[PDB]
Amino acid sequence: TERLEAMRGVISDRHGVPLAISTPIMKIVYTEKSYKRYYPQPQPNAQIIGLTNSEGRGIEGLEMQLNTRLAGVDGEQKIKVSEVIKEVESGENITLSIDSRLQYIMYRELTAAGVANNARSATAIAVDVKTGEILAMTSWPSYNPNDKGGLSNKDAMRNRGAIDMFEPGSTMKPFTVAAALESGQYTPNSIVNTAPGTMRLGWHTIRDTHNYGALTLTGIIVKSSNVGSAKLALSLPKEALPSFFRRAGFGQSSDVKFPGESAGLLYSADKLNSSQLGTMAYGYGLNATILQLAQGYAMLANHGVEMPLSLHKLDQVPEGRQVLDPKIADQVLMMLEQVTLPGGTAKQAVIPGYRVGGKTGTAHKLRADRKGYSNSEYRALFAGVAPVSDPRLAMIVVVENPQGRYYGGLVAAPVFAKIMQESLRLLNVPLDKPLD
Numbered sequence: 244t245e246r247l248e249a250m251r252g253v254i255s256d257r258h259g260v261p262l263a264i265s266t267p268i269m270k271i272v273y274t275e276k277s278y279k280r281y282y283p284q285p286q287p288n289a290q291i292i293g294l295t296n297s298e299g300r301g302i303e304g305l306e307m308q309l310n311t312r313l314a315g316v317d318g319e320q321k322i323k324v325s326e327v328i329k330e331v332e333s334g335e336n337i338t339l340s341i342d343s344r345l346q347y348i349m350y351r352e353l354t355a356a357g358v359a360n361n362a363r364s365a366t367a368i369a370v371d372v373k374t375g376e377i378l379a380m381t382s383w384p385s386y387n388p389n390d391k392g393g394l395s396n397k398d399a400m401r402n403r404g405a406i407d408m409f410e411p412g413s414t415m416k417p418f419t420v421a422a423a424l425e426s427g428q429y430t431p432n433s434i435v436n437t438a439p440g441t442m443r444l445g446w447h448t449i450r451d452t453h454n455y456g457a458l459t460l461t462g463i464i465v466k467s468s469n470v471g472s473a474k475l476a477l478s479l480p481k482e483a484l485p486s487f488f489r490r491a492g493f494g495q496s497s498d499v500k501f502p503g504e505s506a507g508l509l510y511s512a513d514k515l516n517s518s519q520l521g522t523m524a525y526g527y528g529l530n531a532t533i534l535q536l537a538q539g540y541a542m543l544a545n546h547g548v549e550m551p552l553s554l555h556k557l558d559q560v561p562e563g564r565q566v567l568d569p570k571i572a573d574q575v576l577m578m579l580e581q582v583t584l585p586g587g588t589a590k591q592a593v594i595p596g597y598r599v600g601g602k603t604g605t606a607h608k609l610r611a612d613r614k615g616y617s618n619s620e621y622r623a624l625f626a627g628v629a630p631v632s633d634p635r636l637a638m639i640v641v642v643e644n645p646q647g648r649y650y651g652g653l654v655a656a657p658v659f660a661k662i663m664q665e666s667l668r669l670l671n672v673p674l675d676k677p678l679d
Contacts, residue, residue: 244319244320244321244322244328245319245320245321245322246317246318246319246320247317247318247319247320247327247329247331248276248277248278248299248317248331249314249315249316249317249318249331249332249333249334250265250267250278250315250333250334251265251278251280251295251299251313251314251315251334252265252312252313252314252315252333252334252335252336252337253265253336253337254292254305254306254313254336254337254339255336255337255338255339256338256339256341256342256343256346257338257339257340257341257342257376257378257556258342258343259338260283260284260343261283262282262283262284262288262292262339262341262343263280263281263282263292263306264280264281264282264283265278265279265280265281266278266279266281267279277299278299280295280299280306281389282387282388282389284343284346284347285385285387285388285389286350286385286386286387287343287346287347287349287350287381287385288341288343288346288381289304289385289386289387289388289399289400290304290380290381290382290385290399290400290401290402290403290404291304291305291339291341291380291381291402291554292304292305292306292388293305293306293307293308293388294306294388299314300314301313301314303400304402304502305337305339305554307502308501308502309337312334312335312337313334313335313337314334315331315332315333315334315335316331316332317331318330318331318332337555338555338556339554339555339556340371340376340377340378340553340554340555340556340557341377341378341379341380341554342378342379342669342670344669345369345378345379345666345669345670346378346379346380346381348379348662348665348666348669349367349369349379349380349381349662349666350381350383350385352658352661352662352665353365353366353367353381353382353383353658354383356383356640356642356654356655356658357383357384357642359647360642360645360646360647360654361645361646361647362642362643362644362645362646362647363398363643363644364382364383364384364398364403364641364642364643365382365383365640365641365642365643365658366381366382366383366403366404366407366533366640366641366643367379367380367381367382367404367533367638367639367640367641367658367662368380368404368533368534368537368638368639369636369637369638369662369666370537370538370541370552370636370637370638371550371635371636372540372541372544372545372550372628372634372635372636372637373545373550373635374550374553374557374560375498375538375541375549375550375551375552375553375561375563376553376556376557377499377537377552377553377554378636378666379662379666380402380404380554382401382402382403382404384398384399385399386399386400402501402503404532404533404534404641405499405501405503405504405505405532405533405534406503406504406505407505407532407533407641408505408507408508408530408531408532409530409531409606409622409624409641410526410527410529410530410531410606410607411526411529411531411536411604411606411624412525412526412527412604412605412606412607412624412652413467413525413526413602413603413604413605413624413652414526414531414536414602414603414604414624414626414639415488415523415524415525415526415529415531415604416463416464416467416472416524416525416526416602417464417540417543417575417578417579417602418487418488418491418539419472419475419476419484419523419524419525420460420463420464420472420475420575420578421487421491421543421567421571421572421575422475422479422483422484422487422488423460423475423478423479423483424460424571424574424575425487425567425568425571426479426480426483428478428479429460429475430460431459431460431461431574431577431578432459432460432461433459433460434457434458434459435457435458435459435460435463435471435474435475436456436457436474437451437454437455437456437457437458437468437470437471437474438454438456438457439454440453440454440455440470441470442470442473442474444473444517444518444521444522445518447518447522449469449470449473449521449525450469450470451466451468451469451470451471452466452467452588453466455468455470455471458471460475460578461577461578461581463475464575464578464579464581464582464602465578465581465582465586465587465588466587466588467582467588467602467603469525472524472525473521473522473524473525475524476517476520476521476523476524477517477520477521481512481517481520482512483512484512484520484523484524485509485510485511485512485520485523486512488509488523488529489509490566491539491542491549491566492535492538492539492542492549492566493507493509493529493531493535493539494506494507494508494509494529495507495509495535496532496534497532497534497535497538497552498551498552498553499534499552499553499554501534501554504532504534505530505532507529507530507531507532507535508529508530509529509530510528510529526604533639533641534552536624536626536639537552537626537637537638537639538552538637540601540626540627540628540637540638540639541628541637542564542566542567542572543567543572543575543576543579543628544572544576544600544628544634544637545563545572545634546569546572546573547565547566547567547568547569547571547572548563548564548565548566549563549564549566550563550564551563551564576600576628576631576634577600579600579601579602579627579628579631580598580599580600580631582600582601582602582603583599583600583601588603589601589602589603589625589627589653589656590656591653591656591657591660592625592627592656592657592659592660593660594629594660594663594664594667594676595676595678595679596674596675596676596678597629597630597631597663597664597667597672597674597675597676598629598630598631598632598675598676599627599628599629599630599631599660599663600627600628600629600631600634601625601626601627601628601656601659602625602626602627603623603624603625603651603652603653603655603656604623604624604625604626604652605621605622605623605624605651605652606621606622606624607620607621608620608621619644620644621644621645621651622641622642622643622644623640623641623642623645623649623651623652623653623654623655624639624640624641624642624652624655625638625639625640625641625652625655625656625658625659626638626639627639627659627663629663629667629672630667630672630674630675630676631675632675633675635667635670635672636663636666636667636670636672638659638662638663638666640655640656640658640659640662641655642654642655642658
């Protein structure tokens with residue numbers, strides 16, 4: 244009697260492009276047939292797909308997670324030729340939500356941004372706002388799983404997007420404003436005094452980039468006022484923000500439930516303090532992931548309907564979660580478009596032919612000697628949506644420890660412009676902005 248090795252299932256992209264395949268291999272008297280795993284699009288897909296053992300077992304990513312479905316069942320055959328004791332059962336073929344072309348484009352630009360910025364890493368995600376499908380999710384630096392030598396687990400192995408949590412910063416501002424709009428205390432045109440560009444929250448003092456004076460709720464977003472944001476928190480009921488942020492998906496891991504996925508950090512209003520609630524308003528007394536960020540912006544661009552995040556191609560269309568009223572979501576959407584226009588703080592996110600709506604952010608490390616916030620250690624963030632008239636894609640870009648042209652989040656904005664434009668054209672999304 245001899246074993247009959249089950250061919251491991253094919254992992255493919257949404258259009259059937261093979262991403263993980265198995266090829267017959269022989270051991271030499273008699274022969275022994277085994278299978279060798281091969282990854283045709285290596286570096287862009289490695290952190291999501293993972294890797295197998297010498298034995299053929301998944302030890303990382305989706306190879307690990309979906310190992311029982313992908314491995315199948317080994318057969319048995321009597322030892323001359325040929326009579327089966329137990330029939331062979333091939334592993335299940337898996338089709339992902341991922342578009343390998345969008346994946347290739349995202350990885351290529353993430354490398355360009357990481358090299359130009361002498362960064363520690365550059366991570367991104369693209370989601371179909373209407374379906375909840377992840378079309379691209381990659382991180383630079385990645386690795387080649389087909390190669391057996393060397394390796395660096397410490398960073399490259401290692402889905403950063405799913406495992407890394409950070410303070411969202413200004414990327415939180417549109418959710419703070421959405422909480423203020425739903426309270427019925429405010430309208431987009433409602434005024435908040437931000438003079439003289441500073442404000443005190445206990446022994447902590449908050450500053451804006453400039454004295455923006457009296458701002459509307461739309462102005463809080465467009466000028467990215469930390470003062471306006473904190474003042475909104477102060478005027479609202481104590482429960483307002485932690486409760487709206489919980490309904491938006493923060494403080495909990497996403498529907499993907501990727502191995503090792505972070506849930507972020509979000510405290511309830513009972514864990515107290517008005518000045519701590521003042522800090523949450525501009526994204527500081529809380530931790531988020533790129534997945535929670537992507538799902539929140541996809542919601543804002545899908546008439547307040549948060550579609551469940553998925554790494555698998557759909558064979559049912561979910562109804563989604565109605566987190567916000569459609570009028571509020573549309574209002575916030577309109578404020579995000581204005582951030583990219585003259586007078587705005589996200590002008591470098593602009594794409595010709597496509598109306599863009601988004602927000603920059605900066606996530607600063609606390610600093611070892613506790614002498615304020617670190618100027619070197621920080622994440623440049625960009626959360627955006629396009630085309631604004633009928634949004635198709637939500638995209639988050641995170642650049643770790645950049646040393647480039649701009650200080651702060653602005654560094655992640657032209658990276659988004661690049662990926663979003665090429666991604667919308669590849670999907671053949673019709674233009675919605677007059678060309679000049």
